[PDB]
Amino acid sequence: MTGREILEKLERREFTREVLKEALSINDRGFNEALFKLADEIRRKYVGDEVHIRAIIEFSNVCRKNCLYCGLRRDNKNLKRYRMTPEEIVERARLAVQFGAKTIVLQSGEDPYXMPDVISDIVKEIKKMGVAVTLSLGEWPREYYEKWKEAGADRYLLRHETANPVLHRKLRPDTSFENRLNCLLTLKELGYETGAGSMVGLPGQTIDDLVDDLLFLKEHDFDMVGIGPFIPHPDTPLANEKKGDFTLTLKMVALTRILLPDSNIPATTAMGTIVPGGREITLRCGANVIMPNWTPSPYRQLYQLYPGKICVFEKDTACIPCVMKMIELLGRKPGRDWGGRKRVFET
Ligand SMILES: C[C@H](CCC(=O)NCCC[N+](C)(C)CCCS(=O)(=O)[O-])[C@H]1CC[C@H]2[C@@H]3[C@H](O)C[C@@H]4C[C@H](O)CC[C@]4(C)[C@H]3C[C@H](O)[C@]12C
Ligand SMILES: C[C@H](CCC(=O)NCCC[N+](C)(C)CCCS(=O)(=O)[O-])[C@H]1CC[C@H]2[C@@H]3[C@H](O)C[C@@H]4C[C@H](O)CC[C@]4(C)[C@H]3C[C@H](O)[C@]12C
Ligand SMILES: Nc1ncnc2c1ncn2[C@@H]1O[C@H](CSCC[C@H](N)C(=O)O)[C@@H](O)[C@H]1O
Ligand SMILES: O=C(O)[C@@H]1CSCN1
Ligand code: SF4
Ligand code: FES
Ligand SMILES: [Cl-]
Ligand SMILES: [Cl-]
Ligand SMILES: [S]
Numbered sequence: 001m002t003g004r005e006i007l008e009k010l011e012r013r014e015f016t017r018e019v020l021k022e023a024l025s026i027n028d029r030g031f032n033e034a035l036f037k038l039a040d041e042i043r044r045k046y047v048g049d050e051v052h053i054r055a056i057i058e059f060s061n062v063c064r065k066n067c068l069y070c071g072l073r074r075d076n077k078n079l080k081r082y083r084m085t086p087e088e089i090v091e092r093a094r095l096a097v098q099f100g101a102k103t104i105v106l107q108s109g110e111d112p113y114x115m116p117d118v119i120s121d122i123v124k125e126i127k128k129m130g131v132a133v134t135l136s137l138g139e140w141p142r143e144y145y146e147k148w149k150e151a152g153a154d155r156y157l158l159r160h161e162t163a164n165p166v167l168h169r170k171l172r173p174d175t176s177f178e179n180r181l182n183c184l185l186t187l188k189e190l191g192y193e194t195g196a197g198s199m200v201g202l203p204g205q206t207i208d209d210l211v212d213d214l215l216f217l218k219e220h221d222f223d224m225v226g227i228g229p230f231i232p233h234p235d236t237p238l239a240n241e242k243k244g245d246f247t248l249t250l251k252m253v254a255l256t257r258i259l260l261p262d263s264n265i266p267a268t269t270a271m272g273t274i275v276p277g278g279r280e281i282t283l284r285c286g287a288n289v290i291m292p293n294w295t296p297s298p299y300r301q302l303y304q305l306y307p308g309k310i311c312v313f314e315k316d317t318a319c320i321p322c323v324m325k326m327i328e329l330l331g332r333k334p335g336r337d338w339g340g341r342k343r344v345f346e347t
Contacts, residue, residue, distance in 0.1 A: 001019075001022055003026050003028055003030065003031030003034070006019055006022050006023050006026065006031070007031070007034055007035065007038065010023065010035075010038060010258055011038065015218065015259060017211055017215065020211045020214050020215070020255065021207060021208065021211050023035065023251065023255060024207050024210055024211065024248070024251060024252075024255075025207060032247065032251065035251060035254050035255075036250070036251075036254050036284070036285040036286075038254070038258060039253070039254035039255070039257040039258055039285050039286035040284055040285055040286065042257050042258055042261050042286070043257050043261075043265075043286050043287070043288055045261075046261040046262050046344055047261075047262065047264075047288045047342070048333075049331075049332045049333045050288070050332070050333045050334065050335045050336060050339070051283060051288055051289065051290055051323075051327045051330070051332045051333070051334065051335065052102070052103070052264065052288065052289045052290070052335035052339030053100070053101055053102065053103070053289075053290055053291075053292060053320065053323055053324075053327075053334060053335060054101070054103040054104075054105045054134060054266070054289060054290070054291045054292075054339075055093075055096035055099075055101035055103070055104055055105065055291075055292055055294040055320060056105040056106075056107055056291045056292070056293060056294055056295070057084075057089060057092055057093060057096070057104065057105065057106055057107070057294050057295055058107050058108065058293075058295040058299070058300075058303040059083070059084040059089050059106055059107070059108050059295075060082065060083045060084065060108040060109060060111040060113070060114070061079065061081055061082055061108070061109050061299075061302050061303050061304075062081050062082075062083060062108070062109050062111035062112075062113065063108075063109025063110050063111060063138075064109075064110045064111070064112060064174075065109075065110050065138070065172070065174045065175070066173060066174055067171060067172050067173075067174075068170075068171045068172075068173070068236060068237045068238050069171060069199070069202065069230060069232075069233070069236060069238050070233065070236065070305050071233040071235055071236060071304045071305050071306060071307065072109045072303075072304070072305060073236060076235045076236065078235045079235065079302065079304070080302050081302070082299045082302050083111065083113060084296075084299065086114075086118055086121060086122050088296075089106070089122050090122055090125045090126060092294065092296055093106075093122075093125075093126045093129070094126075094129060095294075095317070096294050096320065097129045097130075097131055099317065099320040099321075100320065100324075100334070101131065101292075101294070101320060102131050102132060102335060102337065102338050102339065103131060103132040103133070103134055103154075103155075103338060103339060104126055104131055104132070104133055104134070105134040105135075105136060105157070105291060106119075106122070106123075106133070106134070106135055106136065106137070107135075107136040107137070107157075108136075108137055108138075109138070110137070110138040110139065110140075115137070115140060115144055116140070116143070116144040116147045116148065117147075119135070119137065119144075119148055119151075120147050120148060120150075120151040121151075123135075123148060123151040123152050123153050124151050124152060127151070127152035131338065132154045132155065132338040132339070132340065133152060133153045133154050133155070134153070134154060134155035134156065134157060134193075134195075135148055135153050135155070135156050135157070136156070136157035136158070136195075138158070139158070139175060139179060139180065139183050140183075142186050145183075145186055145187055145190055145192075146190060149190045149191060149192060153192070154192070154193060154338070154340070155192055155193040155194070155195065155223070155224070155340075156187045156192040156193075156194055156195065157194075157195040157224065157226060158180065158183055158184055158187065158194070158195065158196065159195070159196055159197040159198060159199075159226050160177070160180055160181065160184065160196045160197065160198055160213075160216065161180065161198055161199060162177070162198055162199070162202060162205060162209060162213065163177065163198070163209070163212045163213050163215075163216040164177075164205065164209045164212060165177040165178070167202065167204055167205060167209065168180065170204075171202065184196060184220070184222075188220075193223040193224065193340060193341060194222055194223055194224070195222060195223060195224030195225065195226055195264075196216075196217060196220065196222045196224075196225060196226075197217075197222075197224075197225045197226035197227050198213045198227060198252075199227075199228060199229065199230045199244065200227065200228070200229050200230065200244045200245070200248055200249040200252055201229050201230045201242065201243060201244020201245055201248065201249070202230045202244070203230075203238060203241040203242075210248075210252060213252070214252070214255055214256065214259060217256060217259065217260060218259045218260065221260065222260070222263065223263060223264060223340075223341045224263060224264040224265070224266075224289070224341075225256050225260065225263055225264075225265050226265075226266055226268060227249060227252050227253050227256060227265075227268065228244075228249060228268040228269075228270030228271055229243060229244025229245065229246060229249045229270055229271070229274050230243060230244040231243055231244070231270055231273060231274060231306035231307070231308075232306070233304070233305070233306050233307055234307065243274060244274070246271070246274050246275045246278060249271065250271075250281065250282060250285050253265060253267075253282055253285055253286045253287055254285045254286045256286065257285075257286030257287075258286075261344065262341060262342060262343050262344045263341065264288060264289050264339065264341055265286055265287045265288055265289060266287060266289040266290060266291055267279040267280070267281075267282035267283045267287040267289070267290055268282070268291070269291065269293065269309060269310060269311070270306065272310050273306065273308055273309050273310055279326070280326060280330060283326075283330060283332070284330070289339070290323050290326070290327075292311075292319030292320050292322065292323045293311040293312075293319045294316075294319065294320070296316050297315075297316055300312055300316075301313075
């Protein structure tokens, strides 16, 4: 099909494997621009002009897992490890709420020390502040997820990474796609707003794999979808692999918006790392969420899933103001409420 025909099928919601594969394979500038315009318009119509701010506190870079892509993998001895105290985390969340954040995201490596009860205690304290709490702590037993939901957690981010089970097991040798999916299903069952998503440009990942990632996301109707490029880290086995392409990754975000029109979709920091101004582009191609870094010094610079991350050299409190300026210069509005998913039931 020509680009014009692919676009027409996307506009009529004929989301076949073939339409998605062709959308990802056509490299014509005119087609891509039209795809991005469509996704921007769908975003505007379904989720409006509010860009929701999720302040992220990366509270520990200790991890028990050994994912091949990740700078926090347990085999990386060239990394100073750190843990914020529970008091530090609560007070740092309070400062973000003082700065206007309406969601606090707590993210870490899979660090056993906190699990499950110290997390529960932190969540209960933050919930007193009248904001949404999102956890992004990795894979844990059902019982831990249940405890955190009873403590008041609202949302959980657990990117599926890659929907190719073979590639998933190779890159994540401690676990499996089946396990990852079972965690996501358990989180949904428990009443979390649940986020999935994937990296683009992983070694060995194909276009057909990206199509499978889109169809997976569409299948499960996730509340949130986090997408970014793979960025190689020098202290990992994938150090010499190519970085994911920004344009391809942006097309994944655009297609995700077209597929899941009422979902919450961040403009990720990895997008702003590989291209200067990449978050702002992504916010104009389907995204409607931003996650300003709220990790304090001196830890911020130690939380390096990938290198060269933007924002690391800035003062503690810079990123909330910075994203508020971004949202204004984009002609957008800050979120007025917690920014939970507002489902638009259709046919
Ligand atoms: C800003 C640049 C360069 C534009 C440019 O420089 N040309 C425009 C100003 C031309 N003027 C109208 C002021 C004067 C014309 C008379 S003149 O005689 O001066 O040329 C234009 C050229 C292509 C545009 C992107 C694509 O669409 C894809 C996508 C659609 C989304 O929905 C919004 C996001 C995104 C990324 C777009 C953003 C932006 O919009 C771009 C980069
Ligand atoms: C934290 C300190 C000290 C006072 C304090 O502890 N303030 C708690 C405010 C709590 N809220 C955010 C929920 C108020 C919402 C009011 S609002 O009327 O916006 O709905 C206060 C004093 C001045 C405040 C900044 C300025 O103002 C400019 C700007 C306005 C944006 O908007 C949000 C960002 C920013 C940078 C502000 C952040 C923060 O706030 C500051 C630093
Ligand atoms: N090298 C790299 N490049 C780009 N993104 C990466 C990366 N290493 C990790 N990430 C991404 O960062 C996300 C958060 S990792 C932190 C939370 C948790 N340990 C977890 O694994 O879910 C991952 O889901 C992955 O998609
Ligand atoms: O892009 C990033 O850096 C982070 C990783 S998971 C949330 N976004
Ligand atoms: S991706 Fe998450 S689980 Fe895997 S090594 Fe990094 S921090 Fe640990
Ligand atoms: S969002 Fe971090 S300094 Fe701009
Ligand atoms: Cl969130
Ligand atoms: Cl994300
Ligand atoms: S900023």
